């Protein structure tokens, strides 16, 4: 984790490098399953905007 293969013409020895931690780190598009399940049942008020599914057709 955190290491890459720098293979190319710009290096004498293509090697694996220990990249440092970026600052600031980008947005992480990850959803954790169990913690969300660990909470009580999500009770969504039914505004019922399925026009999301419907009108986004083109």
């Amino acid at each position: 984790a955190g290491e890459c293969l720098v293979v190319g013409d710009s290096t004498p020895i293509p090697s694996i490098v220990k990249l440092e931690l970026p600052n600031p780190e980008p947005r992480s598009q990850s959803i954790k399953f169990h913690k969300k399940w660990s909470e009580s049942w999500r009770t969504p008020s039914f505004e019922e905007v399925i026009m999301r599914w419907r009108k986004e057709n083109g």
Binding site: K32, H34, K35, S38
Partner: protein
């Protein structure tokens, strides 16, 4: 031919430096080095750990 041989082939899967478990294939033990089985006290620390995100599966 009267030669009692009991040889095992094992593969390292981690280290127990201090009181916490690290992975990696390093720190080769020197010859004539004791082997001490495994107790549940260290196995529990490897597997159960202590965190909210756990899931029993046997």
């Amino acid at each position: 031919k009267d030669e009692d041989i009991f040889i095992l082939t094992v593969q390292p899967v981690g280290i127990f430096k201090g009181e916490e478990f690290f992975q990696g294939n390093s720190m080769l033990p020197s010859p004539t080095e004791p082997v001490f089985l495994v107790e549940d006290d260290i196995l529990n620390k490897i597997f159960s750990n202590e965190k909210t995100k756990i899931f029993h599966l046997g």
